[PDB]
Copies of this chain bind each other. A is one copy, B any other.
């Protein structure tokens, strides 16, 4: 497995790990909290305990070898920004990051994030789309 890596196994991160597994994809799952890493042992090709803000730990992880790395760190803008900053130095092809708010988003754009995710807002758009389909698509 060297295509998908998810850092931060909260509701958002853990959910992509699981869905990837369900779809038969191998995934590197990482978190600083062991209780979180263990909760995703059955869904990860490899579940490691590591501080994503530490360079050496990012090398002991081989994160440089992944095409897509999702930073799903939650209510910790600093760990989130620091992490995306490091792996952007490792010139990772695709770095996706969950943003906490407008400020976070603003630094993430210039810091290296290729895609920025706002769960709340983004799901609101998809829900709007589903509602529209109920009617329009005569669904």
Residue positions of A touching B, CB distance < 8 A: 2, 4, 10-20, 23, 25, 53, 67-68, 70, 72, 77-79, 81-82, 85, 88-89, 94, 96, 101, 103-104, 106-107, 110-112, 117-129, 131-132, 134-135
B103 in contact with A82 (CB, 8 Å):
yes
- Distance in angstroms between the alpha carbons of A4 and B131 in the assembled complex: 8
The main secondary structure of chain A at its interface with chain B is helix
- Contact, CB under 8 Å: A122 / B120: no
Give bound CA distance, A131 to B85, whole Å.
21
Interface pair B85/A120, CB less than 8 Å apart: no
Cβ–Cβ contact A19 & B129, under 8 A: yes
Residue of B nearest to A19 (CB): B128
